[PDB]
Design an enzyme around this catalytic site. Structure first.
Site, PDB file in Angstrom:
ATOM      1  CB  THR A  16      21.862  32.265  13.536  1.00  0.00           C
ATOM      2  OG1 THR A  16      22.559  33.742  13.411  1.00  0.00           O
ATOM      3  CG2 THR A  16      23.142  31.515  14.033  1.00  0.00           C
ATOM      4  CG  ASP A  39      18.719  13.675  -9.913  1.00  0.00           C
ATOM      5  OD1 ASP A  39      17.634  13.390 -10.672  1.00  0.00           O
ATOM      6  OD2 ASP A  39      18.718  14.561  -8.694  1.00  0.00           O
ATOM      7  CB  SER A 224      14.900  16.104  -4.874  1.00  0.00           C
ATOM      8  OG  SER A 224      13.491  16.823  -5.244  1.00  0.00           O
ATOM      9  CG  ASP A 260      16.324  28.835  14.067  1.00  0.00           C
ATOM     10  OD1 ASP A 260      16.313  29.358  15.089  1.00  0.00           O
ATOM     11  OD2 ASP A 260      17.361  29.266  13.461  1.00  0.00           O
TER      12      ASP A 260
HETATM   13 CA   LIG Z   1      17.667  31.652  14.854  1.00  0.00          CA
END
Ligand SMILES: [Ca+2]
Ligand SMILES: [Ca+2]
Length: 279
Positions: A16, A39, A224, A260
Site C-alpha cells: 500500500t 509483442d 509497455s 497514491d
Molecule cells: Ca498508500
C-alpha cells in the site's frame, strides 16, 4: 508466498506504500491461466520461464525474438523472478519485427488470432492479453481490441509514452479494454506516461528489470512495462477466482491504491494496481 529483494515493481503491486522490497502473493501464482503476449516474440528458452512460455504465432520470417521487448514483457507477466503471476502460461504472438515496429493490419490480425487460438488451449482460469504497443488513433485497431475483449479475453494495453492524452492513441483509446499508465518507484506518474479519461489503472513502468534475449536481464522504462504488470495481475486474480476476464479491469480499479500517485492531471484516475494479498 514472499519473494525478497523483488524488483521494485513487484514489491509495489503487493504493498500500500512505496519503498518496499518484498513481493507478497498467493502461491497459486496464476496457475491455470494463460497470457498472450502480443509483442516482438518471446525467447521461450529463457531459464526464467521454466518452460511455461512458447511461441504460438508469428507474422514474420521467424518466431525468434530478435528485439527483446516481447521477452521483457513476457517476463514481467510470469517470469520466475521478474513476473507477477509466476505460474502462468505464456503464449507469444509476434506482431512486430526485430526493430519493434509493425503494421496495423498485422497487429489486428494478431489480435483476431488470439480470439480464436484460445479455444485450442487449456486455460481453465481464464485468458489475458498483454499488448505493449501503440500508435496513432485507429478505429479498426480499437474495434480489433474490442473484439478481443468481447471474445472473453482480458485485454490490457499500454497508454503510450507521449506525455499526452491517450484518447489520440490506439488501441489505448478503446474504452472497453484496460488502458494502463506508468508510474515510477517514488509513486509519481512516469514523465513519459500518457493520461486522460480513457486510462483505467496505473502500474510500475519506470526502470523495470525483467528478462531479455540471450538468457539475460535488463531494466527499461515505458508504459509497455506497466502493461504486463496489470496483465500478470489479472491472471493472478483470475486464478484466485476473484474476477473474470470481462470484469478484471473493473475489479483491479475497484481494489487499487487510491490517490497514491502524484503528478496525476485532473480527470485522470489516481489508481495504482494492487493485489491486496494478505498472508
Ligand atoms: Ca498508500
Ligand atoms: Ca477502459
Amino acid at each position: 508466498a514472499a519473494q525478497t529483494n523483488a524488483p521494485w515493481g513487484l514489491a509495489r503491486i503487493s504493498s500500500t506504500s512505496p519503498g518496499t522490497s518484498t513481493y507478497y502473493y498467493d502461491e497459486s501464482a496464476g496457475q491455470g491461466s494463460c497470457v498472450y503476449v502480443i509483442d516482438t516474440g518471446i525467447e521461450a528458452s529463457h531459464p526464467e520461464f521454466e518452460g511455461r512460455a512458447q511461441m504460438v504465432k508469428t507474422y514474420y520470417y521467424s518466431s525468434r525474438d530478435g528485439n527483446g521487448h516481447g521477452t521483457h514483457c513476457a517476463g514481467t507477466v510470469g517470469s520466475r523472478t521478474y513476473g507477477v503471476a509466476k505460474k502462468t502460461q505464456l503464449f507469444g504472438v509476434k506482431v512486430l519485427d526485430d526493430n519493434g515496429s509493425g503494421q496495423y493490419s498485422t497487429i489486428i490480425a494478431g489480435m483476431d488470432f488470439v480470439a480464436s487460438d484460445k479455444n485450442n488451449r487449456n486455460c481453465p482460469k481464464g485468458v489475458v492479453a498483454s499488448l505493449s504497443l501503440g500508435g496513432g488513433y485507429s478505429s479498426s485497431v480499437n474495434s480489433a481490441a474490442a473484439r478481443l475483449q468481447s471474445s472473453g479475453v482480458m485485454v490490457a494495453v499500454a497508454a503510450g509514452n507521449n506525455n499526452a492524452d491517450a484518447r489520440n492513441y490506439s488501441p489505448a483509446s478503446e474504452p472497453s479494454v484496460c488502458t494502463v499508465g506508468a508510474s515510477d518507484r517514488y509513486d509519481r506518474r512516469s514523465s513519459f506516461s500518457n493520461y486522460g479519461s480513457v486510462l483505467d489503472i496505473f502500474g510500475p513502468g519506470t526502470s523495470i528489470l525483467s528478462t531479455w534475449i540471450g538468457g539475460s536481464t535488463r531494466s527499461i522504462s515505458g508504459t509497455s512495462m506497466a502493461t504486463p504488470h496489470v496483465a500478470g495481475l489479472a491472471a493472478y486474480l483470475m486464478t484466485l477466482g476473484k474476477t473474470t476476464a470481462a470484469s478484471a479491469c473493473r475489479y483491479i480499479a475497484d481494489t487499487a491504491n487510491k490517490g497514491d500517485l502524484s503528478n496525476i492531471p485532473f480527470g485522470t484516475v489516481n489508481l495504482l494496481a494492487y493485489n491486496n494479498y494478505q498472508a
